Structure 1
Amino acid sequence: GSWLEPNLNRKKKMMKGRPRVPTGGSTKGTTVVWGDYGLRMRDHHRRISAQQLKLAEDTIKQRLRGQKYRLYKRVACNVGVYVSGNEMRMGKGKGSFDHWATRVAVNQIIFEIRGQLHEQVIRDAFRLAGHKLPGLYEFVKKGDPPVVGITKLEDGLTVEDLKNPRKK
């Protein structure tokens, strides 16, 4: 399949579910692993659609067309959103399939890029995509520390210091 069209059956309906809310000190997906730069969702956890991610990719390609680069996608659309008729009355079972989506936690990388482009050009492309994606996004470089919740582990800060009851 693909990252926008999974190899799943549309007939089997899926519950709404909720994005992952790490409350134990997890840093999964909060670091650039493949490319040199990334696009991080820094405000809140959402459920992005396959149509909103496809538009974000076209925006980056439209801005970086005619140049050498390598775009990695760190999210996959594997959540079937079944929308019942907004004109229908409550009940009578679940709704029909509408589109594919993906749940993303806070401070997680959406895209990554690696190329000989200037830092400014990549920033503009990511900014244009952040305006067309739901939420607020941030430019991230490779090597910066991970993020535990909404707190960056900067200045030698560790995960054990965030768990220590004594902080003052």
Structure 2
Amino acid sequence: KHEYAPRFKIVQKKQKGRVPVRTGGSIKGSTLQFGKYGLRLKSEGIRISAQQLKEADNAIMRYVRPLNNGHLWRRLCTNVAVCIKGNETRMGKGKGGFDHWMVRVPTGKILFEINGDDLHEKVAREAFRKAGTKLPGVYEFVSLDSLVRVGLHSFKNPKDDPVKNFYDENAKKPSKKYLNILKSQEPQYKLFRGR
């Protein structure tokens, strides 16, 4: 509903920033969560405007609405407010009036997701290709068995990466603050703190 037009109470101008190249191997929003088939970015990290996203959504919908129990999950919201000073002004007196909303999209991230009752995969693939024709990146069809993109030419299965109880790890190799707290909890300090 509000993914292409956030309702920040205090509307305000924003700096340009940069699209996060996720050097640490994030895989956040790079996985199929809601649907069966999806459309992910394949190229370098890119900014997608609100209008472009809307058009992609519309393109996808043409295939989704005919389906029985058809659904489209829009995975990303255009949260960054872009201002643009007109291409007609001498220079930076002041800044720029609000123009459009935009989203910073990392390399591996999923944009859309679909799942119908009577949805064959070929149709879904076609729809997602047609959606990609309207967006500024280069995109890729992603199924539930197809594995998570991280880099431009690199891949990963989330099933593989290890599970860890971090409290236990902390206890094993404790910080100074934690040790101080533990000492405080002990009786030769707790009795004589005198509050």
Scaled by the length of structure 1, the TM-score of the pair is 0.86
What amino acid is the match of 2:25? G
C-alpha RMSD over aligned residues: 2.0
1:125 to 2:127 alignment: yes
* C-alpha contact (below 8 Å) 1:10/1:97 kept by paired residues: no
SS of aligned partner of 1:16? coil
Given the superposition, is the C-alpha separation of residues 97 and 10 from structure 1 closer, same or farther in structure 2, using an over 3 Å criterion? farther
**1:153 maps to which residue?**
156
**1:61 maps to which residue?**
61
Between structures 1 and 2, the one with greater strand share: 1
Query: Structure 2: which 5+ runs fail to align?
Result: 163-195
Q: Displacement of 1:37 after TM fit?
A: 0.9
Aligned counterparts, 1:59-138, within 5 A: 59-68=59-68, 69-116=70-117, 117-138=119-140
**2:188 maps to which residue?**
none
Q: Displacement of 1:127 after TM fit?
A: 0.7
Q: Residues 92-138 of structure 1, C-alpha deviation per residue, up to 9 Å, x if partnerless?
A: 02110111111110011000011130111111111111001111100
- Identity over aligned pairs, percent: 47
Scaled by the length of structure 2, the TM-score of the pair is 0.75
Partners of 1:145 and 1:133 in 2: CA distance: 22
Larger Rg: 2
Q: Which moved more, 1:136-145 or 1:125-134?
A: 136-145
Q: Residues 45-67 of structure 1, C-alpha deviation per residue, up to 9 Å, x if partnerless?
A: 11111100100111111233322
When the two structures are aligned, how many residues end up with a matched partner?
158
**2:28 maps to which residue?**
28
Given the superposition, is the C-alpha separation of residues 45 and 97 from structure 1 closer, same or farther in structure 2, using an over 3 Å criterion? same
Q: Displacement of 1:157 after TM fit?
A: 7.6
* C-alpha contact (below 8 Å) 2:45/2:105 kept by paired residues: yes
SS of aligned partner of 1:38? strand
